[PDB]
Design a protein around this ligand. Structure first.
Ligand SMILES: CCCc1cc2cn([C@@H]3O[C@H](CO)[C@@H](O)[C@H](O)[C@H]3O)c(=O)nc2o1
Ligand SMILES: CCCc1cc2cn([C@@H]3O[C@H](CO)[C@@H](O)[C@H](O)[C@H]3O)c(=O)nc2o1
Lengths: 810, 810
């Protein structure tokens, strides 16, 4: 049908058709009179997976012969989403399968809708890990993702009476065709026990043993025949475990609970034991596998030439003491040499500067659960503090600020300080975020070791985030400039010579109109909701957090409503305002924000005076597959975090790539986006980082904005007096109180400038042609934000390996 | 190689070979340089399973069109063992796969050893269920096995310092290729709640919901292209379950624990809630499936013409109140009509008369867990007691003896009384066992309804228990009489005309010698043990229970030892005495017996005076696949339960079929075996049932035997004084005490006659040729004991359906 989707050759189509029937019969044990759409989906998933394996086996074989340096990406989160279409795209099977399934009388798109998301992450950090695996495979790196096979991923979100309800994400109910269990590669992981000192060194004994069983999932590169591996560990009890006989069998669940469920608290730290167990489990099973693969190549001097381990934040920070542990206690290297190897092996990426997000584990926890690792940590700290003492003699305050050990009420290990001490590189995730690390929370460490600190601005994969979700935009691009930009996104710059091209203008706008039509219809079919597709689609989708200021969006929405009520017969650019995102289950404030959003919708969507000029929708269960649908449909992208709080963001990049304009603050990667497109092609408003600092110094008094801004005061009074909650007039007292007395994120300070900049957007929107030319200028400068660029910078500047676009043979 | 194993055609072999490679590559994702024997086993298991599915799909389709009466066999136990070879045998693929795997350079037998047993049962009762499914498929009945997919089967038995240790049977670690998950057919099962009375009848509300998810396993008939289904339910939590968010997810295990583990207590009842939950779960999920299949054919009058449900003992006795419940509460039939339908649908088989084995559930349990079913039971009882009152007016003692409700300390429901009241037929499992039910525990019920009581003597399948495990005996039989006896075991009678045939004599004996050689070598390779294969192989294998009197065997063994020590230089027929079997984990006495057995081995096997004349081995982890190996190798079968206690036995039948002679009491089916072979061809000793009764009347005084039998007294003194336990002289005081003061099974009363009959066996053994002619006379009369005979009697006399040997088309 469309060209970027590949060839439907008659040999290929005929082959797909018969493999499909074979799987239906043999694998599913169904015949065509009993099959449901879910059987058909499985039959196609099995047929497409058959194309991977040849390539999978030979990619692994190729790495055995060439023995290149191996990259290990350790993360507790891989936010994968659906695998079927992505696999078709990367293998160039998409049109062939479309054709093969049409001939069998099936609609492929309807079958794609049946696949569950692999929701093994919370948001930005887990999705970054997914884009990275894709980019790594596309660039030919010998790279392995390592994580945990959670049995339940991020919860499904249901809204009842406008409140979030959580329900278990049972993503494996029907099976996962993509994974291959490898119980033959099971490995023991130890917990508890005690430390014994022999003549022959320290020994860790009387441990409980949990088994780690790996499942491998293939990661196909883009059309290069590379298939890398994502290995996820599952927890299993050993067989002599506890060994009521009955009760003993039933208590095997205590061990297996380690991999049962993903923790849904993203931007707040909770020091729960089960969480620490998950962190150690993935780090211990992974390092053993790494060391085993290395030994099939005594001399650990070569280890850092053959291994890079990247830590995705501090979740796997225990890789550092664990690698020391294995090198010192089991392989008998001396301390200093083991340390050299560790530092040269490990690298650490930080993803936030929010104080309450940072991991700080109570010492009494580590002491009970990992008593050897605590000893190793104390020894690391001591040697580290002696380098500090020797470079800044007499600076006793530096010593306590830099310690890995925090003193106080309860002593804590600062996991971030551990990663910096034990890694040869530390990077932030956007230029401004990396500068902030150097000037604020890691200032001391940077003064000690300036050479460790780097920036690697985030990116997203253009395979999923353009080709897969937005085939019509990919197609009109490919008409003018060819297909090569899919693996070289810098080529989109060539689109700048089409900015005054009348045909391209009409085509970019036609694709947007189509995506909006399609999405309007998805709203009606699957959630009974009536939207005007001629309205500007104003979208804010991301996890619910105070720093992300969905509340500021709320205020703008209420202002627009109050302006319509004031002058009903005046023309306004109509909008559909959509906000979506999950709240962490114990984050009371986040839950209240969701409730306000739906309460505003209850009022606004039913005012006959408003008409179809303003709609407010809460998008339920935002997740990767919902992102693939709403992002192509958006006109306006809301990225409106308080300057200094969003480390990077990556949603912002999805929307720039798919033809929405951006309203936001100079935060995170928004700064680099504007700088690439030009400040004129972006809607920038609000305090910069410097202005926030000036405001903290003097004190933030919210009362001042409330006294000086009549439109703000009216909204506050409405909130307080029960305008949006007629039956519980005081429903929202916590929000108003927070806004008035302890808003760490200064919602009111950005309010005026935000409302004003929002009028500039409505004005541009009234002139379709100039709106579209600005779109074109965004899409055309979006190339820097490809995760291929990102990964090639990690490869060259941290891992010491060269990317490669060369095909392996088919 | 051998003819009963089928053709190795060149088309077939070439086809198997390539399907094998396809599975290795595509299914296992391995290549030949990485594969382990376990990968090869899987590749063959997948290749053979592909031959089933065509036949599976069309057998199910055939039942849809013909709509025959359906049999539902409900059991909590299916003791399946390995599936690979059985499947090859029944499909006639055995020689073809042998050939295909040899050409790939593999040894098929070595691959067969890798398959885990499906140990979803404890012993006789669970294995009967397995033989029955096989016979049902072979006789073309539209029959379904329904049970529970336990995640852990019967425990693996390890002996340490001569004690049983139990360890978890994790039979699914590596996957089960035979099963197909059917999550699309998941069904809700309810627990707890309360009963509400409306105008429109009773309603069961506020229940907890557990989901039952079915897994289907194919059951191939012998060479008839019939493939029936075994459906086993697994427990799953619903998704809004409990719905710490975290704790809520982790508590999903409480619901799923229902199918976690098989209860290993066979011949003792424990009233634990988890057990009652397992019983209700399988009965509720199964009846819904049954009713659903029936409705795709309002008029429940036809239900009993379209459905038979067989209850394998009282484990699924709740089918009765549950069927009432659905008919009365949900379909709104009136009581009397629902009762008629229930009675005509259900049939009950009893498998024991041991009082402590019978299920008697506390009313406070049923009241909490199943409060509607208790109401239904009270109503059943009342109506039942009114028929009793009216037929035996004034017999108030009959009324309390027959009540379903036992009065006392705690009130209990007698589940056996419920099955008899709610079933149109009640059968025992051997002729003498069925007579005992009529004369003793069910005398009252028989006087009320003589027409319900039947006998169906047990049988074993000659596919697994001859062809599969003893190919060399099957072959020499097939040379003389052809192959037809495999599905018509009565044809073995034709072997009587070979009893004086010199060649047949030498061949029967050659096969026995070969099986012994092979088994001697299995002992050495897999458990470092040195046996003389020229000794008589004296075997007792079965669960460890006092009634089965492994202790009497112990006494004979010690007597033989003491006789050798007394006259060392006298000739004795050498024996290898092997005893094996698991003990229920809380059955202290059973555990002590195992310990005595190994302690006797420690003394006897190391006495240089004994030489290789007497060995005592304990066979560890006896289970179905160990039975397939030791039974062909046996010369002497020990079936020595106290008369009246072994309802039938089925091991006895395995050994008769495979050429061992039998020493035993006139118990269970031993009586019918002797009667079929002739009493002269069997070693019968000991009290009959009548003699045991005469002894209870007068009182059993064990002291009397101890005073009158010098050889017995010596053994007792050795036991007491620490001869067999030098380091704990009083280790065995419980055993001696039990033997002396409270032996419910009268070990000493049978001792003299047992030792004497054992000398008659040694004497026959000294004359090889006459030993063998007696073997031939056993094997030749073993036909009655085929489970095909058994099932054809259930079909004709209980289910109302005709068996059929006709092929379905290929
Ligand atoms: C102790 C670890 C805690 C943690 C940090 C953090 C950061 N990010 C996001 O990681 C994304 C990937 O770098 C960034 O684009 C976003 O700005 C950032 O908020 C995220 O999604 N969740 C993570 O939780
Ligand atoms: C409440 C249910 C309890 C139960 C009865 C019982 C009987 N049998 C065996 O069932 C076998 C199958 O009928 C018979 O050959 C054996 O004699 C008999 O002991 C068995 O293996 N286990 C069962 O436990």
């Amino acid at each position: 049908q469309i060209s970027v989707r590949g060839l439907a050759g008659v040999e290929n189509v005929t082959e797909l058709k018969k493999n499909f029937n074979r799987h239906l019969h043999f694998t599913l044990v169904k015949d065509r009179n009993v099959a449901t759409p879910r059987d058909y989906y499985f039959a196609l998933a099995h047929t497409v997976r058959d194309h991977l394996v040849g390539r999978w086996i030979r990619t692994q074989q190729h790495y055995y012969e060439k023995d290149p340096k191996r990259i290990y990406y350790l993360s507790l989160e891989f936010y994968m989403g659906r695998t079927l279409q992505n696999t078709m795209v990367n293998l160039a099977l998409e049109n062939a399968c479309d054709e093969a399934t049409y001939q069998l009388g099936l609609d492929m798109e309807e079958l794609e809708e049946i696949e569950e998301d692999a929701g093994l992450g919370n948001g930005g950090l887990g999705r970054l890990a997914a884009c990275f695996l894709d980019s790594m495979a596309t660039l030919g790196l010998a790279a392995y993702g390592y994580g945990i096979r959670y049995e339940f991923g991020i919860f499904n979100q249901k809204i009842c009476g406008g409140w979030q309800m959580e329900e278990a994400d049972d993503w494996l109910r029907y099976g996962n065709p993509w994974e291959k269990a490898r119980p033959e590669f099971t490995l023991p992981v130890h917990f508890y026990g005690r430390v014994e000192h022999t003549s022959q060194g320290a020994k860790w004994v009387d441990t409980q043993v949990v088994l780690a069983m790996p499942y491998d999932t293939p990661v196909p590169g883009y059309r290069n025949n590379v298939v890398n591996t994502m290995r996820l560990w599952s927890a299993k009890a050993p067989n002599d475990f506890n060994l009521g006989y009955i009760q003993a069998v039933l208590d095997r669940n205590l061990a297996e609970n380690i991999s049962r469920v993903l923790y849904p608290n993203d931007n707040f730290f909770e020091g729960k034991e089960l969480r620490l167990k998950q962190e150690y489990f993935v780090v211990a099973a992974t390092l053993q596998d790494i060391i085993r693969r290395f030994k099939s190549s005594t001399n650990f001097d070569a280890f850092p030439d053959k291994v890079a381990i990247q830590l995705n934040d501090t979740h796997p920070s225990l890789a550092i003491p664990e690698l020391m542990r294995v090198l010192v206690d089991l392989e008998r290297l001396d301390w200093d040499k083991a340390w050299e190897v560790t530092v040269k092996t490990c690298a650490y990426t930080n993803h936030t500067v929010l104080p309450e997000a940072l991991e700080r584990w109570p010492v009494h926890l580590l002491e009970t659960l990992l008593p050897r690792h605590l000893q190793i940590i104390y020894e690391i700290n001591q040697r580290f503090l002696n380098r500090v003492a020797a470079a800044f003699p007499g600076d006793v305050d530096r010593l306590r600020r830099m310690s890995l050990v925090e003193e106080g009420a309860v002593k804590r290990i600062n996991m971030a300080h551990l990663c910096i001490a034990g890694s040869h590189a530390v990077n932030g995730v956007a230029r401004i975020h990396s500068e902030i690390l150097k000037k604020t929370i890691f200032k001391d460490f940077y003064e000690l070791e300036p050479h460790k600190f780097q920036n690697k601005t985030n990116g997203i994969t253009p395979r999923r985030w353009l080709v897969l979700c937005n085939p019509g935009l990919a197609e009109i691009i490919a008409e003018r400039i060819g297909e090569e930009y899919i693996s070289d996104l810098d080529q989109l710059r060539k689109l700048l010579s089409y900015v005054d091209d009348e045909a391209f203008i009409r085509d970019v706008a036609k694709v947007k109109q189509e995506n909006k039509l399609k999405f309007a219809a998805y709203l009606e079919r699957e959630y009974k909701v009536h939207i005007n597709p001629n309205s500007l689609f104003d979208v804010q989708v991301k996890r619910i957090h105070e720093y992300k200021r969905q509340l500021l969006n709320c205020l703008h929405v209420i202002t627009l409503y109050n302006r319509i009520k004031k002058e009903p017969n005046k023309f306004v650019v109509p909008r559909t305002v959509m906000i979506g995102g999950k709240a962490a289950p114990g984050y009371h404030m986040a839950k209240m924000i969701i409730k306000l959003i739906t309460a505003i919708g209850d009022v606004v969507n039913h005012d006959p005076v408003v008409g179809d000029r303003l709609r407010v929708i809460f998008l339920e269960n935002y997740r990767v597959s919902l992102a693939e649908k709403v992002i192509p449909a958006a006109d306006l992208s809301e990225q409106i975090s308080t300057a200094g709080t969003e480390a990077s963001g990556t949603g912002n990049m999805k929307f720039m790539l798919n033809g929405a304009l951006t309203i936001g603050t100079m935060d995170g990667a928004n700064v680099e986006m504007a700088e690439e497109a030009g400040e004129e092609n972006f809607f920038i408003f609000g305090m910069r980082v410097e202005d926030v600092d000036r405001l903290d110094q003097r004190g933030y008094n919210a009362q001042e904005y409330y006294d000086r801004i009549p439109e703000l005061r009216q909204i506050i009074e409405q909130l307080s007096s029960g305008f949006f909650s007629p039956k519980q007039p005081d429903l929202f007292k916590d929000i108003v109180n927070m806004l008035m007395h302890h808003d760490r994120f200064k919602v009111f300070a950005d309010y005026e400038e935000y409302v004003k900049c929002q009028e500039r957007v409505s004005a541009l929107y009234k002139n379709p042609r100039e709106w579209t030319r600005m779109v074109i200028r965004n899409i055309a400068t979006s190339g820097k934000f490809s995760s291929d660029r990102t990964i090639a910078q990690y490869a060259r500047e941290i891992w010491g390996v060269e990317p490669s676009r060369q095909r392996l043979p088919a």
